[PDB]
């Protein structure tokens, strides 16, 4: 369930390996006197299973290295202390009361302020990205926003490291500004020509709720699901 | 209003408290289009006396430089009779174009972050592909040699087979086993790329399989152990 548990485990074999290299010393030494006295034959060869020894040793160093590189993956949040702090003031502006919790208007105007496309007080109308970041950040309807209820969002909005692809999915929707189809001139504003390239070569084409085909339409929920489903 | 309010009063030296009033100096447009970036503007420099310049110093740079263009002068804002369309106009305009360009930098890092990992683990699919290829083929062209079971009748020859063999057990094995466990390394570096990545399964074609070279790898162990048998025999027979 968790990664730290791994590292016992890459550990345990870490106390076997010292043990067995004992136990090849035991073996190849023996091999010294029986090739020795007068050569023989004995279905086998020790040299062999001494490079597949050390072969288990480099992929267990290799595994476990590359273990510690996946815990640092996934725990490094790389958002700055200048960000963090920002946010702080914000929150800190947002909520005047000092009660530390803001209303959901006072949360409205901090994702305002954090510049989020937002469009506010229609005439008697109702928009669901307000209503899809209140459950995201307070599904209860609690109707308050805590410090760590915001920067739970913050942090998912901010930057680095990826829980689930669900996100991939909804923010190539907002990527291409909630069109169900993408084009390469919008992703080549974000990203590299060479993975632009990749994405047009290995992504197919988009087909609409009506059937009809754009030469230009692009789907990235079939590719997300293709590859990361 | 209250966006620009909050973001320019913390900013220092402009306050803003209406739309008609509190813009006719100039400064609170170049104050925000400096919070954003301030990288093009010294604001410092400025001052409201100025007012003239300061919108048409903050209005040039603000059509070329960023990208929004509509048609007033410094003296529209500048007379005492208000626009209120343009300036909502204007304001919705930066607002949307700001939260879009953000959205646009998060959104790239993110998306280059993941395919910038997954081109580097493909670069070193095709590098095991071509391993994979090489090793097989060289594996079964080698078969063909060992299968080779006639030669000649001599003690000298014999044990000179002998010796050759005994060669290519201890110096050659060691080496042509040893891909064998680089290309696992490399097939386990894969696995741990993908639930890095955490994409579908890669599901390597048929006819390249671990399974294969293992079949193939008995195999050769087979034919190289009686063609060992044989050598004996007709060794000790000799003998």
Redesign the interface.
């Known amino acids: 369930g968790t990664l730290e548990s791994q590292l016992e485990a890459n550990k345990r074999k870490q106390k076997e390996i010292q043990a067995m290299k004992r136990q090849l010393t035991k073996i190849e030494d023996l091999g010294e006197k029986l090739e020795e006295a007068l050569v023989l034959?004995i279905?086998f060869?020790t040299?062999?299973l001494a490079?597949?020894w050390d072969?288990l040793f480099?992929?267990g160093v290799?595994?476990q290295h590359?273990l510690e590189q996946?815990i640092q993956?996934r725990d490094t949040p790389g958002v700055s202390e200048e960000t963090l702090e920002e946010f702080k003031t914000t929150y800190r502006?947002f909520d005047e009361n000092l009660t530390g919790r803001l209303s959901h208007k006072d949360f409205r105007?901090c994702l305002?302020?954090l510049?989020?496309?937002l469009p506010m007080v229609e005439e008697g109308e109702s928009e669901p990205k307000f209503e899809k970041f209140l459950d995201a950040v307070d599904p209860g309807r609690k109707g308050y926003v805590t410090q760590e209820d915001y920067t739970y969002f913050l942090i998912d909005?901010?930057?680095?490291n990826?829980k689930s692809?669900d996100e991939?999915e909804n923010?190539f929707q907002?990527?291409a500004e909630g069109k169900a189809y993408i084009t390469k001139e919008d992703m080549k504003?974000?990203?590299?020509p060479?993975?632009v390239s990749?994405?047009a070569s290995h992504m197919q084409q988009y087909v609409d709720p009506r059937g009809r085909s754009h030469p230009a339409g692009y789907d990235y929920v079939g590719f997300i699901n293709?590859?990361?489903? | 209003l209250?966006?620009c309010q909050?973001?320019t009063a913390?900013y220092p030296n402009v306050n803003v408290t209406n739309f008609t009033s509190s813009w006719k100096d100039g400064l609170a447009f170049n104050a925000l289009i400096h919070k954003?970036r301030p990288d093009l503007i010294d604001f410092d420099k400025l001052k409201d006396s100025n007012a003239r310049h300061n919108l048409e110093h903050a209005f040039d740079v603000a059509e070329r430089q960023l990208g929004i263009i509509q048609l007033l002068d410094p003296e529209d804002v500048f007379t005492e009779n208000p626009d209120e369309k343009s300036i909502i106009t204007y304001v919705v305009a930066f607002?949307?174009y700001?939260?879009?360009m953000?959205?646009?930098?998060?959104?790239?890092?993110?998306?280059?972050?993941?395919?910038?990992h997954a081109?580097e683990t493909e670069k070193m699919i095709e590098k095991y592909s071509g391993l994979a290829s090489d090793l097989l083929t060289w594996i079964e062209q080698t078969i063909t040699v060992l299968n080779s079971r006639k030669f000649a009748n001599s003690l000298a020859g014999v044990q000179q087979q002998l010796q050759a063999f005994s060669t290519y057990?201890?110096v050659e094995?060691?080496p042509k086993?040893?891909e064998k466990?680089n290309l696992?390394?490399l097939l386990?570096?894969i696995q741990?790329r993908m639930r890095?990545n955490?994409?579908?399964v890669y599901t390597p074609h048929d006819g390249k399989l671990v399974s294969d070279i293992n079949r193939a790898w008995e195999s050769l162990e087979e034919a190289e152990?009686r063609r060992?048998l044989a050598l004996?025999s007709e060794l000790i027979r000799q003998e």
């Open positions: 034959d279905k060869s040299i062999g490079q597949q072969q480099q992929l290799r595994r590359n996946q993956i502006h105007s305002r302020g510049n989020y496309y909005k901010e930057s680095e990826i692809s991939i923010s907002a990527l504003q974000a990203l590299t060479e993975q990749f994405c293709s590859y990361f489903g | 209250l966006w909050m973001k913390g954003h607002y949307h700001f939260s879009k953000k959205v646009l930098a998060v959104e790239g890092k993110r998306v280059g972050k993941v395919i910038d081109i057990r201890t094995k060691p086993f040893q466990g696992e390394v386990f570096t741990s890095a955490n994409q579908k152990y060992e004996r």
